[PDB]
Amino acid sequence: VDCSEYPKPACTLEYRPLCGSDNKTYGNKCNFCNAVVESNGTLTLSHFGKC
């Protein structure tokens, strides 16, 4: 997963989760990459799937 073209003002809402380094399950890549940007790069991906 690469968040370089983010952010995005909107995301589609299918659920294919990813687990972030803040232990939050991100419901899809669009939502996870918008949060990496919002944290100014400090959140990273822990592993694929729910946390």
Partner: protein, 185 residues
């Protein structure tokens, strides 16, 4: 199974938008972006109860797909959760609407604008969308937007979340009904 319940394809989970039919053939509408690339749909995460296979999918540009039911005995109710839907209508600015989805359940709000363009990136831009101030989160894709016993849209995407508030865009359902020649019941 009714509007708002979860649906699983090979890649993830979306929500059933509305149960529709043409003649004696039943189908369900959902989001195009969930139908793109999926062939079989199931009703549970373990994939043990089959619902059917994708019959059409329109995404990007529009955001709707339809699945034809191959499971003969699951109940296909014409409702959203248990609210009945008896017809389809066009959205209008100020209309009070409610959405139901498999992750967040039911949430309400109003249409704030029509015909908006939403660019989800990489060439996926969709046009002609209903904007509202209803929140929605991952997994809610394709669930129904309705008003009363009126079907109005299918969830396509948005921003924000339900704890803090968000904006959600929906594909007008009249357009899907007419592209496939089906109707709500």
């Amino acid at each position: 199974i009714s509007g708002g319940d979860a649906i699983y394809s090979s890649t993830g989970r979306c929500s059933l938008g509305f149960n529709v039919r043409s003649g004696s053939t039943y189908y369900f509408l959902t989001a195009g972006h969930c139908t793109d690339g999926a062939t079989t749909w199931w009703a549970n995460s373990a994939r043990t109860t089959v619902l059917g296979t994708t019959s059409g999918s329109s995404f990007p540009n529009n955001d709707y797909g339809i699945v034809r039911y191959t499971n003969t005995t699951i109940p296909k109710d014409g409702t959203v959760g248990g609210q009945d839907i008896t017809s389809a209508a066009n959205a209008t600015v100020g209309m009070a609407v409610t959405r139901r989805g498999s992750t967040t359940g039911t949430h309400s709000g109003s249409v704030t604008a029509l015909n908006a363009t939403v660019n989800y990136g990489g060439g996926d831009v969709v046009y002609g969308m209903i904007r509202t101030n209803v929140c929605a989160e991952p997994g809610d894709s394709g669930g129904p937007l309705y008003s009363g016993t009126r079907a109005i849209g299918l969830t396509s995407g948005g921003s924000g979340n339900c704890s803090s508030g968000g904006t959600t865009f929906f594909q007008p359902v009249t357009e899907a009904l007419v592209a496939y020649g089906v109707s709500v019941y």
